Design a protein around this ligand. Structure first.
Ligand SMILES: [Cl-]
Ligand SMILES: [Cl-]
Ligand SMILES: [Cl-]
Ligand SMILES: [Cl-]
Ligand SMILES: [Cl-]
Ligand SMILES: [Mg+2]
Length: 288
């Protein structure tokens, strides 16, 4: 399957160029070699960003099997260094104490290994009450326990992302046929209240219209701040050109001119609110 990795690299290099990023052969090939045994059956997607994060393109391999510890694999191959910071111990704690059924890894095509993904199945979700007991959890989860309880989302953790490069964590809520994020989270009063409570930028008119199409949210937390770092609404659609947003030129190019067919496939779009403003994300699915 060495020639398979060669085609995949060639797709990664070109897709990077579509969004004005240059892939690093020296960073990406070790990752392809490290995960060669799980790439064929993985879901592979490319995620572009506006704002500061526009300087790299993320590549994600998801739906990786139970029995792969993707952080351990990255450590084993020297793709990321050992650390005593709790970020390095959280994955194992989450995998034991939340009903995780598959996983994933995430890398910048220029920057190298950045994140792991831990996925419960939609039929049985994770709980904030179990997260707050984990030795390596950010203190900010319990520090915002009021927020998760207020908005009725504490028992519907649907994905955990761990970013080793930034020392942040993402908690997703909602998705698939699982428990639903309450409707009030997506109505204007709710969007204003949430962003206000979290000290984030007041929602734009574009964000309000986008929120009407959303049923997945995720919260970004860190170990070094008691405050939620950002709040992101997500929308899944096979017609991203029809989203009620103005698309960045790089996003339009990724939709229209990727080196592969996404005919029919869903894209995943996000709008992140921070204390300074709104930044967008779009994921295109190469292998599904
Ligand atoms: Cl993110
Ligand atoms: Cl509801
Ligand atoms: Cl996103
Ligand atoms: Cl998203
Ligand atoms: Cl910011
Ligand atoms: Mg259910």
């Amino acid at each position: 399957e060495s020639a398979d990795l060669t085609e995949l690299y060639s797709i990664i290099e070109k897709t990077a160029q579509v969004v004005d990023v240059t892939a690093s052969h020296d960073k990406v090939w070790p990752i392809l070699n490290a995960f060669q045994d799980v790439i064929a059956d993985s879901v592979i997607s490319f995620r572009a960003s506006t704002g500061s994060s526009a300087d790299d393109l993320d590549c994600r391999f998801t739906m990786l099997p139970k029995g792969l510890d993707p952080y351990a694999r990255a450590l084993e191959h020297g793709l990321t260094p050992k650390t005593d910071h709790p970020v390095g111990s959280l994955l194992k704690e989450v995998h034991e104490n939340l009903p995780i059924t598959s996983c994933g890894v995430d890398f910048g095509v220029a920057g190298g290994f950045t994140k792991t993904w831990s996925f419960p199945s939609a039929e049985k979700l994770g709980k904030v009450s179990e997260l707050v007991k984990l030795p390596s959890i950010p203190d900010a989860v319990a520090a915002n326990r009021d927020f998760f309880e207020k908005w009725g989302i504490a028992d519907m953790v649907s994905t955990v992302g761990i970013d080793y490069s930034k020392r942040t964590m993402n908690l997703y809520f909602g998705g698939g046929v699982g428990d639903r994020v309450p409707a009030g989270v997506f109505e204007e009063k709710g969007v204003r209240a949430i962003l206000g409570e979290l000290g984030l930028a007041a929602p734009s008119e574009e964000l309000l219209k986008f929120c009407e199409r959303s049923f997945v949210i995720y919260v970004t937390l860190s170990w070094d701040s008691p405050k939620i770092n950002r709040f992101t609404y997500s929308v899944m659609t096979p017609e991203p050109l029809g989203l009620p947003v103005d698309l960045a030129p790089t996003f339009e190019r990724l939709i229209k001119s990727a080196p592969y067919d996404t005919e029919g496939r869903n894209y995943v779009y996000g709008i992140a609110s921070t204390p300074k403003g709104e930044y967008h994300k779009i994921a295109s699915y190469y292998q599904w």
